[PDB]
């Protein structure tokens, strides 16, 4: 009801100026698809909880802290490139040396933790 009740007073042309309502609508369509499909399925039922951050992040003092740090992270993207390059170098070296070790359930090198594949 909110989605239709808002467009008839704010117009679709200007409705997308706000950042929150652009993604807020997608939950409404997503939520209504699965309830129709109720009577594959986890993609849209998961988005129901995401409505909490859409309006409860209106406190001034926590939004500023989040926005300031996120913008700071975006302004320093090359520092995080070293960590990725460090991970890439050491992971590749690990496959050559310790990639042929057999996986055992009782060992620390097991089906969940090993060097057999790059991920």
């Amino acid at each position: 009801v909110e989605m239709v009740l808002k467009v008839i007073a704010f117009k679709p042309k200007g409705y997308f100026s706000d950042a929150w309502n652009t993604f807020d609508s997608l939950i409404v369509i997503g939520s209504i698809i699965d309830v129709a499909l109720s009577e594959s399925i986890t993609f849209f039922r998961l988005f129901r909880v995401m409505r909490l951050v859409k309006l409860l992040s209106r406190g001034e003092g926590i939004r500023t802290l989040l926005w300031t740090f996120i913008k700071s992270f975006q302004a320093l993207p090359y520092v995080a490139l070293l960590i990725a390059m460090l991970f890439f170098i050491y992971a590749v070296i690990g496959m050559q040396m310790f990639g042929k070790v057999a996986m055992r359930d009782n060992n620390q090198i097991n089906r969940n933790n090993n060097f057999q594949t790059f991920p």
């Binding site: 802290l65 700071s72 320093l76």
Partner: peptide
């Protein structure tokens, strides 16, 4: 490098 990234981000926010 983790604290190098942590502090560098913190450096860009002393104004705030």
């Amino acid at each position: 490098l983790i604290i190098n990234l942590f502090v560098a981000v913190i450096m860009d926010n002393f104004d705030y």
